[PDB]
Symmetry: C3
Subunit: 266 residues, 3 copies
Amino acid sequence: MQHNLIAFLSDVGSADEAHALCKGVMYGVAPAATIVDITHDVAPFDVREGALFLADVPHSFPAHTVICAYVYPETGTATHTIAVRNEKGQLLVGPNNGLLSFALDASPAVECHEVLSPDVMNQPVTPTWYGKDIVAACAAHLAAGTDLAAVGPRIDPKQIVRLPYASASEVEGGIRGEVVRIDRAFGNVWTNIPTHLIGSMRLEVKIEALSDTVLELPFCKTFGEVDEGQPLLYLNSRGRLALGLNQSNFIEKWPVVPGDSITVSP
Amino acid sequence: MQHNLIAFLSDVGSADEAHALCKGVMYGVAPAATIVDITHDVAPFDVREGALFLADVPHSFPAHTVICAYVYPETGTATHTIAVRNEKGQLLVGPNNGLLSFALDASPAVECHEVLSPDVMNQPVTPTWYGKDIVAACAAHLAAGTDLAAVGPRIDPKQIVRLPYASASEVEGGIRGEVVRIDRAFGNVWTNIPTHLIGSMRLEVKIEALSDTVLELPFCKTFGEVDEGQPLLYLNSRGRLALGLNQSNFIEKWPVVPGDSITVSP
Amino acid sequence: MQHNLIAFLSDVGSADEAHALCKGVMYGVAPAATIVDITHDVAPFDVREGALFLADVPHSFPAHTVICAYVYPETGTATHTIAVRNEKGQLLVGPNNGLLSFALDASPAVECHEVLSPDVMNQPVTPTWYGKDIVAACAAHLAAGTDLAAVGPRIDPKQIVRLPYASASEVEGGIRGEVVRIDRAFGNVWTNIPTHLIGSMRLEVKIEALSDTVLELPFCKTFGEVDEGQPLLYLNSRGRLALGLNQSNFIEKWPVVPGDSITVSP
Ligand SMILES: Nc1ncnc2c1ncn2[C@@H]1O[C@H](CCl)[C@@H](O)[C@H]1O
Ligand SMILES: Nc1ncnc2c1ncn2[C@@H]1O[C@H](CCl)[C@@H](O)[C@H]1O
Ligand SMILES: Nc1ncnc2c1ncn2[C@@H]1O[C@H](CCl)[C@@H](O)[C@H]1O
Ligand code: MET
Ligand code: MET
Ligand code: MET
């Protein structure tokens, strides 16, 4: 099945030609394809950050999409590239190192194969750039309509490496969660606390590390509901609880990092 | 009318997936469309900077263009999104907060509507991301050929919020103007002084704040007319007067900011 | 001959609209064209860096590609823009200041013309932006199928300015070379030492400036062959010798710059 829309993510940056050579390879194999960047500014080697960036990609993108993604410090070793068809019908290609975990939570694997066949690769294969020669090349082949079965042998979806993600839970108070990611352009803090856990309960937010700092925060539908510069709690596009300042940068005011505990209570 | 070329600007950056999810929504509604980024690195919340970046966009881009732009700290409140047809025939979609002001100076609004109809939106609409769910979604619908009248009710062009812009004027000497923007890649300074005001009159340039600094500058057609490192005055692509150093960075040598007065005389 | 794929490089950055106005001009002249960025974050005025970024572009990109590239501090002077057909069949447009040197090493010029004819330019031509009004505009015309002979007069390939590049040589030991570029996203160091010179000979690497620092390094096929954080020598995608740390940044650990000598011996 043709998938004329390739969505492309990596940790190689857009500041040099590296990412564009990959596209060069892709347009060569799939001249009908539209290539769109997700981002290339995933922090180096950071599989987790890459995986978070891919989470909402299945839902935002149409079914004829190939998600092409690589953050691959394991390039040129035993850790293989995989190719996947999800429940939506989209195709996904990347290293089997956890990168596709959160994309697959959004729309599970129906079929998966290890990418092993040289006919879907860019020959010769450079040991230090599987991203281009295997991931990108295979992604374009699948876009052009190559059968998923031709890429290599079938594997069970549990052979796909998954990244552990902490779930928010009820304590007495009391909801305990953590900082998942930071919306870097604005400095809004994203937690793992979903809509339904807070639905129960101005609220009290404790950020213990550091430094046992408590804030009394209003819950708003949007930023403009508090005065300029003032803090707020809101639910984001993903149904997760978030912290921000109206027209300012929250983490510059409260240097929280991913992993940090967030407790919210009446 | 089909407008297969969507030109896309925001303040969300390109360092994460946010801007690409918007494109995901757009390719879904308009699979025939070509999406090209203007830039996503408008400083956060900075409507003015966004508006300057859009100025030359009507003229540089063909008539079948939809200009899709959002810098929207007012997302999820009473400040609506608007959709506009200009005199060139282009379509423009963005928040009614001043963002489209300078694009509209270049090619005025012929027709404008508030974007209110749910059928041109991405349901459900997230209060904190009108950019994606209203601005991007509506832009794609108009690209695909949706009638502008279906987006919501007509409004008068004066109901479109405009940003004030200072005009350069003749004093005795003597031309008084100000710093509009900085060409950040190179550090060239852009003023609001047009070709015709200086046509009259090496020249003398005073930058009063700060610190009453006077420079004797040659007027050149281009950078290579003075020695490497030396300062010059020239007219830019926009017919505005500019200050630069040949193969160096002017603002790193003279820390001027937008708003600062520039006086030029014989 | 139609060349529907335009690959675009400059030093104007992607942080503002400048690069996108160029694309605006290109889609206008060539509505069938696909425009893909190589990168716009070439350091300002740095022709050499631009030229290195273009090296692998002929080989990575299909034959129907127009390579459109400008780093042009000589804009609006006697240094002309050139247009070139290479041995692969690709077309290249840029300033005659050395920028196309390394792209042309990969696939030599078969035909070259100075770009002089106003009918392949964007009128009126702004002296300070040949990038947009000549380079971009001509690139789109050639993409759309304009004959290369219509752009201006033919010239001999030796009238194309070439940048000098240092070759690695055998000494006694002993191979002497230098730092060519830094893989900035990761901090891997690229040398000019090819596969065949080291084929002869853990190895000893001396980086004399600075500060006569010697390292005993293993030669590996890829990063994961040494422990996390440890240094390695490997051959890259280009058949050049490279230095890196496994999942870390080499130049942050050893502040080498392009030009620096690298000596490798048993
Ligand atoms: N010095 C280094 N150590 C470990 N991994 C590295 C590396 N340089 C690049 N990569 C990794 O090579 C991949 C291309 Cl296949 C990129 O995604 C990047 O993660
Ligand atoms: N903490 C914050 N305060 C005010 N506005 C914010 C914000 N975070 C994002 N936006 C705004 O949300 C818009 C998407 Cl609709 C973006 O353009 C951005 O301007
Ligand atoms: N202050 C300055 N001095 C010398 N060259 C400059 C400059 N500002 C922009 N350019 C040069 O103008 C070109 C567009 Cl034609 C860009 O590629 C850039 O290299
Ligand atoms: C260091 S990863 C693979 C090397 C490739 N040449 C690149 O530019 O990233
Ligand atoms: C903070 S603005 C709207 C939120 C959206 N999730 C984003 O990535 O920007
Ligand atoms: C300074 S180079 C040519 C000027 C052009 N206006 C630009 O944005 O770069």
